[PDB]
Structure formats: C-alpha cells, structure tokens
Amino acid sequence: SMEMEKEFEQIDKSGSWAAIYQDIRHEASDFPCRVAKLPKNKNRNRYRDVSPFDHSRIKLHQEDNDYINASLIKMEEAQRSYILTQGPLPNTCGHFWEMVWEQKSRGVVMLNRVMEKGSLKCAQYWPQKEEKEMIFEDTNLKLTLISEDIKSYYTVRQLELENLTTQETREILHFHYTTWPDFGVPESPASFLNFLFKVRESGSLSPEHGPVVVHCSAGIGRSGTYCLADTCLLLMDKRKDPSSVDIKKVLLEMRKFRMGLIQTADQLRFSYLAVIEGAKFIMGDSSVQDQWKELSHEDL
Ligand SMILES: O=C(O)C(=O)Nc1sc2c(c1C(=O)O)CCNC2
Ligand SMILES: [Cl-]
Ligand SMILES: [Cl-]
Numbered sequence: 001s002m003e004m005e006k007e008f009e010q011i012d013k014s015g016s017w018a019a020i021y022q023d024i025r026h027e028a029s030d031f032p033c034r035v036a037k038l039p040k041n042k043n044r045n046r047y048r049d050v051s052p053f054d055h056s057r058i059k060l061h062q063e064d065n066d067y068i069n070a071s072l073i074k075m076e077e078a079q080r081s082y083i084l085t086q087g088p089l090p091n092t093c094g095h096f097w098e099m100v101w102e103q104k105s106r107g108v109v110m111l112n113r114v115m116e117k118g119s120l121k122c123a124q125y126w127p128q129k130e131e132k133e134m135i136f137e138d139t140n141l142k143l144t145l146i147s148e149d150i151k152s153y154y155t156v157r158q159l160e161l162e163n164l165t166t167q168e169t170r171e172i173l174h175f176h177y178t179t180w181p182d183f184g185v186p187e188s189p190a191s192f193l194n195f196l197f198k199v200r201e202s203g204s205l206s207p208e209h210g211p212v213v214v215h216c217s218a219g220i221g222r223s224g225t226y227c228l229a230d231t232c233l234l235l236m237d238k239r240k241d242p243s244s245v246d247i248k249k250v251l252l253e254m255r256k257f258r259m260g261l262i263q264t265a266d267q268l269r270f271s272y273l274a275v276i277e278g279a280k281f282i283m284g285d286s287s288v289q290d291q292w293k294e295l296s297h298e299d300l
C-alpha cells in the first residue's frame, strides 16, 4: 500500500482531519490583492473575502480596466497550468469569455450549479439553446451552443466562441459537474474520477492549448479540490511513483497562486481518497476506468 494510504489511515484513526486542514490554512501563503480591492473593482468580485493575488492574477488585454477575479495556478514541477476563477457575475460574463479567448483555453470546467442553496452562485454565462446565441457587447464576442451530451450528474457542451472583431472562431468544451454541493464533496471517488478523466480524455489539458479554466462559485473550494486531485495524479504519472507525491505540499504550492483552495477538511479528505483511488489507473490498471464509469451511473 502507498505512503499516502498509510498517512490517510493514521489521520482517520486519530481523527485529525480538522487539525491537519487548519495547519494548512495557517501555513498558506499571504500575498497582496491590491488591484482586486480597488474601489472601481468592487462590482467585479462576487465575495469580499475571495480575491486573486496581484502576482498571479489574469490580466484582461483591454486598456479600460484589465481586472478579472481569476488566478493562474502555474504548477512548475507538474508542468500544468490552470486558471481558477469565480463564477462570473451578470456584469463580468463578457470579461470571462474575453479571458478564455486571450488565454487560448480549450476547456472550461464548471463544478457548481447556477442556483445552489436558494442563491444565485453563478451567472447564466453560456447559451442553453442552440438557436439563442449570446453576444457580449463590451468585449465583442459571440457564444453559440453547438451541442450537449447530458449525463445523469454532469453535462458536456460544445460551444463556439467567435471574436467579432476578427471573425475568428474557436470550439470550447464545457464540462459541467451538476451534483457536487457547495462546501461539499462528490458522491464518490468513482463519479469524481470518471468526470476528471472525461476532461483529460477530451484533450483540453493538452500543452498545445492555453490553461483550462476551472470555476465553482468562488473558484477556491470545489475548484481547489478538483485541481489538487488532477495535479497529484499527473505528478504520480510523470514519475510512475505514488510515493513521490506529497499531497499537502502540492496544495500549499497551489495556494501560492490563489487563496483558500479547498474550503473544508472533508474536501481535503476527499482529495486523498480520489488520488489514492486514481493511482490504480496511473500505475497500469486501466480496467478501473470502466469500473468508475459503471459505479457513477452516468447513463440517464
Ligand atoms: O463554490 C465553491 O466551491 C466555493 O469555494 N464557494 C465559496 S468559498 C467562500 C464562499 C463560497 C460560496 O460559494 O458561498 C463564501 C464566502 N467565503 C468563502
Ligand atoms: Cl479605484
Ligand atoms: Cl450571479
């Protein structure tokens, strides 16, 4: 059994998930967020306590106001980057797709629903009907729903994003997880890993593309959980060595680039479970992938 499994058992036995998680919060980086806190950006932030650090914020390529609440998580050893961002607001959907355009992203991973716990956690930023495309006048972009593949707990959409200035167009894949509760965890490691591997298999993480965009409502809790699991699996894979992966150190590295990644101790505990289970595929048992698809009951 792997060292992360032994660590997992000892933390479970001693009941120390809350203390381990608080240790991470105490040790996490603290960098300034001066642009995010400028008065003119107040209505560009969904949550007053969630801001991108200045050193890693994504800048929009426009001259009026380049601010978006979004961070580039640049994982050097893993050689994968992610853009983590908040669920766009009704006035920032144009900025969101501007950022997708300028950063050359091929995929968007959405881990939340538009309404959760009775509240609007994210704007309806993509078109729900092929024949009702959206136009973002402020950033001069057009967004059309091309097709969607609805499964029982996630939906994959094919979108066309057009730069109306140049009339160039790109296909964006939208991976929408619809049964992951806010401040909660997926239903099982299997359904989570099935979804995560759906993203991987799409090619959206290819280094020929810009960084994948990942968001939940705040871009930190569910987004941090997804990214930690994905990065740890990729590191294990590069080295073919589960024991070289220190999950808490990877999370602390990610938190150099955006605050608050992973919002509960149970989400941390879930990340361990997902990485431990996914290690079976990494280390050469491809049949677990079929097993996850079955256990996830994705068919409708
Ligand atoms: O969507 C997520 O997974 C996430 O981290 N959400 C977060 S983090 C966070 C909040 C929320 C929210 O959704 O209310 C409220 C304000 N404090 C921090
Ligand atoms: Cl200002
Ligand atoms: Cl909203």
Ligand SMILES: [Cl-]
Pocket: 025, 259, 260, 261, 262, 263
């Ligand atoms: Cl935190």
